[PDB]
Design a protein around this ligand. Sequence first.
Ligand SMILES: *[C@@H]1O[C@H](CO)[C@@H](O)[C@H](O)[C@H]1NC(C)=O
Length: 398
Amino acid sequence: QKPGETKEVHPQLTTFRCTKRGGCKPATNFIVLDSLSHPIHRAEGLGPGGCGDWGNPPPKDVCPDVESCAKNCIMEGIPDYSQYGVTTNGTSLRLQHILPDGRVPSPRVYLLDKTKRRYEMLHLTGFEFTFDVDATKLPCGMNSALYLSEMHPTGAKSKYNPGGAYYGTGYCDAQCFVTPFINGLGNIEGKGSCCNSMDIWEANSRASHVAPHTCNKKGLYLCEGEECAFEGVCDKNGCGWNNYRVNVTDYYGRGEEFKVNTLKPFTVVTQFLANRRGKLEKIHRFYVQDGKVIESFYTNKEGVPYTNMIDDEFCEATGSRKYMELGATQGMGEALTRGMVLAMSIWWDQGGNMEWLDHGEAGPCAKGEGAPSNIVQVEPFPEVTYTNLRWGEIGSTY
Ligand SMILES: *[C@@H]1O[C@H](CO)[C@@H](O)[C@H](O)[C@H]1NC(C)=O
């Protein structure tokens, strides 16, 4: 959409780059909200209205084609991110799902490089990503996410999309959702926005989930028809890793009875271990809390391969069929090697109550407990803070 007259003022965030040799050294990065989370409105004389709702093509009256859409729909800068529940303090990024005044901004943001015109492209195959988190205000049904998508580095900046990454354009993930704009261009044909994504962290105070999601395309792929569906080009389910799902129930939770105690801050390490040919083999998640390394659990379930890391053997046996079919662990790793964008978000789920994350087979949460109507009766103001985001040499971030 066309950038408007209001200026964009991105939050600055200090992150780190790590080596065994020099340790963690500070870096400047900026934060940007999703393009379609910016105010979008019609050009002067075209009246009231936006330019389409999530899940739809843009309106045919203002967006009969890409060129018209580029002129007729205006995207405004955000001069004050705190209005969207987004703030930074030094190395800390706070995402508020609900504001005191009742607004539910449910922010999703990306990491911009220091120039503010390209996303910071992380290449994590053979490397580790680490961050500190405070999950105390995330009850059942809430999802703090920190994850990677193979978005285009300039947000596919182009003639009709001049805003680019500076305005948060170019979002995609393994779900192939239809958005009214894709790569900053009117989605006239109503395609889905598909790409490989590595869900490093989808979690609340009750459960913690890690999942690669493969697509059989490189980059952002606009899918049509069945390509967007379950047997299509992306892995909607991902290869899910969650202690509760492998019959370990005392690893992560609210209280001293859990190895990771989500009433207190902790550190989340994710290692992307590559084989002798440089291909991704295994994904290893452990934690650190009160200065103690908390090692990954091992699986403990009849019919589930014995392992303490995600790999092809586990994924296959736990029925991650499209993950294997669409390129398996090696395929995830090719994406990561090409370069990925970091996204961080806080959301909830009106349709399904985030049950896949923390209910039944996946956690201690009751039926109904994660509905949005119940969340606000448990924690009125859900929020998460990620701090000291840092990546680099295996063994160097903690
Ligand atoms: C779950 O783990 C327990 C040990 O805590 C074991 O007794 C039980 O048989 C396991 N369940 C399955 C189905 O593997």
